[PDB]
Design a protein around this ligand. Sequence first.
Ligand SMILES: *[C@@H]1O[C@H](CO)[C@@H](O[C@@H]2O[C@H](CO)[C@@H](O)[C@H](O)[C@H]2NC(C)=O)[C@H](O)[C@H]1NC(C)=O
Lengths: 50, 50
Amino acid sequence: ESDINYLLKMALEKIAFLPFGYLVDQWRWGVFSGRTPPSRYNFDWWYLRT
Amino acid sequence: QPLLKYFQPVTQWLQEQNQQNGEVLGWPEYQWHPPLPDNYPEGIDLVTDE
Ligand SMILES: *[C@@H]1O[C@H](CO)[C@@H](O[C@@H]2O[C@H](CO)[C@@H](O)[C@H](O)[C@H]2NC(C)=O)[C@H](O)[C@H]1NC(C)=O
């Protein structure tokens, strides 16, 4: 039980962050490439977030 | 570019009409979906033509 508690505490920061980072730089690469014009900043950001 | 040259009069007229009507090009508020009509599944055979 202690092992499960410790690993779930660790997995709440080392696993919940994996979608982030990937998400952030994917959005920024899209913005730089021109695939995301200034009229689609929030749209693509929240599409990637969901 | 030839496609835009072909449609030059109609696109010019459209731009003039949109400017006069004062509409916003594109679709901000991407997170918008139309409401369901009241009693939709059983309210379809109702005449609504002017
Ligand atoms: C983008 O959404 C915002 C947030 O709802 C809209 O701002 C609201 O506009 C209404 C109508 O003028 C105001 O009554 C609200 O007070 C505004 N909200 C805030 C928090 O200021 C805005 O109109 C939307 N913009 C576009 C371009 O669609």
